[PDB]
Amino acid sequence: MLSVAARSGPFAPVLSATSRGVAGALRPLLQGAVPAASEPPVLDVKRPFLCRESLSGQAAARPLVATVGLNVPASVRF
């Protein structure tokens, strides 16, 4: 009894994925549609670490402490 997807009765279409490159005559039931979701906020390019001298101190040693403010920038310190 091969066909590993049909080994599982109800878990046939969950273990498998069936794309259709050229969609045929019969339409599939539950066509489906993505909702128009949101977008993530944009952020600046960060600091890469390409040397041992820049990486020093980046390893965390203390618990995470966050700080917000009315007119000071938000920060997180480890």
């Binding site: 794309s19 259709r20 490159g21 050229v22 969609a23 005559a25 019969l26 066509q31 549609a33 128009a36």
Partner: protein, 446 residues
């Protein structure tokens, strides 16, 4: 070798016989070790009389909850004890109870089917809990938004007729319906002349006839008041319904016109027309090279989330049209594009387009009947609607009659200068008024 016509005539023939009760027993045989046996009853929402508007649905629920000789889950246990699958559905015109099983257990399943259509034990506690279950799944089917637009389109197209009401009916009828009303519905509409016993797969026709004579003998056969419930033609209404809820992310719009029904041959031609326009959703992997003009336009302009054409047939009536889901900003544009496609089929259909639609319809008709469940569905629905099983070679002969001139004549007969029925649900204020949609259904250049 073997061409298309020889393979189409090599398909085995469906044998139909009539019992003394008027029960129509039909079957067809293949090499399969399984079987699909079902009972199709000519009873739906069209026969309900606005006060028992969910009677067929509520019997369709209670049919599997126990009979007189098999009280409750023991019946259920029996079918699980043979590993068979039991399914049902209820339309506006037809009700079906079908079982997939093995062929080697053909007798017992027929016996089960027998009491399911004639010996159902309707208990008050089961009535209460299935009333709650039906309320739960009307709440569930309110989320299936294309079903909501389907119901809205039927209501606004068949206003004032028994074909507007849904199969599950209103909520108050679910809250108030009593066992006597269900008994009246089952005594009126579950008689033997309206039942087709269909079987598909590795089943002997004579064996099934012996089983139907043993079990399904004397189902009702008697009107008990000499009152035949006859169907009456329903008035089509060019109308618009607009359910507006801007909180939804996507909008579903269905546009329709009349189609002729089951027993008019140009349905086949109309099917070819749908095969020209076709279906699409966002996960189709063709790109900008799909053969359907509406699909390529909607891909290039990024209009749709999905669209889908339909032809829906009842007794001398039906709904022919399209249904799409998209965001708000696209809606108006797509309506224009969709109507333009229809007008192209009314005016300037070509021959390669008709040939492509014919090949699509050939593949749809053959590949739909793969397995015993859709074959059995085709048998039962064809004996209820056409009065006979139309063979696939007859379908191929009718598809071959279609050329471009008669196709655009039929499309001009059913689409051009006709008032549509429009249903909408979602952010639909960019969906135009009825005047612009109606004006888009004809060209000023012809």
């Amino acid at each position: 070798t073997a061409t298309f016509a020889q393979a189409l005539q090599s398909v085995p023939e469906t044998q139909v016989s009539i019992l003394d009760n008027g029960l129509r027993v039909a079957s067809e045989q293949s090499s399969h070790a399984t079987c699909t046996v079902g009972v199709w009853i000519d009873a739906g929402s069209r026969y309900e009389t606005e006060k028992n508007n969910g009677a067929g649905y509520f019997l369709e629920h209670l049919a599997f909850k126990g009979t007189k000789n098999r009280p409750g889950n023991a019946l259920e246990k029996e079918v699980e004890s043979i590993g068979a699958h039991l399914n049902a559905y209820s339309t506006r015109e037809h009700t079906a109870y079908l079982i997939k099983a093995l062929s080697k257990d053909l007798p017992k399943v027929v016996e089960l089917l027998a009491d399911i259509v004639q010996n159902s034990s309707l208990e008050d506690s089961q009535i209460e809990k299935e009333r709650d279950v039906i309320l739960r799944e009307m709440q569930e089917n309110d989320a299936s938004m294309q079903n909501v637009v389907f119901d809205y389109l039927h209501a606004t197209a068949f206003q004032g007729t028994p074909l507007a009401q849904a199969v599950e009916g209103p909520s108050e009828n679910v809250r108030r319906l009593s066992r006597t009303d269900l008994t009246d519905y089952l005594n009126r509409h579950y008689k033997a002349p309206r039942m087709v016993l269909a079987a598909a797969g590795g089943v002997e026709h004579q064996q099934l006839l012996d089983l139907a004579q043993k079990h399904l003998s004397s189902v009702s056969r008697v009107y008990e008041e000499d009152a035949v419930p006859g169907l009456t033609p329903c008035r089509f209404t060019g109308s618009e319904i607009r359910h507006r809820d801007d909180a939804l992310p996507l909008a579903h719009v269905a546009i329709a016109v009349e189609g002729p029904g089951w027993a008019n041959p140009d349905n086949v031609t109309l099917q070819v027309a749908n095969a020209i326009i076709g279906h699409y959703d966002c996960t189709y992997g063709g790109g900008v090279h799909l053969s359907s003009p509406l699909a390529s336009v909607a891909v290039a302009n990024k209009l749709c989330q999905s669209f889908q054409t339909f032809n829906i047939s009842y007794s001398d009536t039906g709904l022919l049209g399209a249904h799409f889901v998209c965001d708000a900003m696209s809606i108006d544009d797509m309506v224009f594009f969709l109507q333009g496609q229809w007008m192209r089929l009314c005016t300037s259909a070509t021959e390669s387009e008709v040939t492509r639609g014919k090949n699509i319809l050939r593949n749809a008709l053959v590949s739909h009947l793969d397995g015993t469940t859709p074959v059995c569905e085709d048998i039962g629905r064809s004996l209820l609607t056409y009065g006979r099983r139309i063979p696939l070679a007859e379908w191929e002969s009718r598809i071959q009659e279609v050329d471009a001139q008669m196709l655009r004549d039929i499309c001009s007969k059913y689409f051009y200068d006709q008032c549509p029925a429009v249903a909408g649900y979602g952010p639909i204020e960019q969906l135009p008024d009825y005047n612009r949609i109606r004006s888009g259904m004809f060209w000023l250049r012809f």
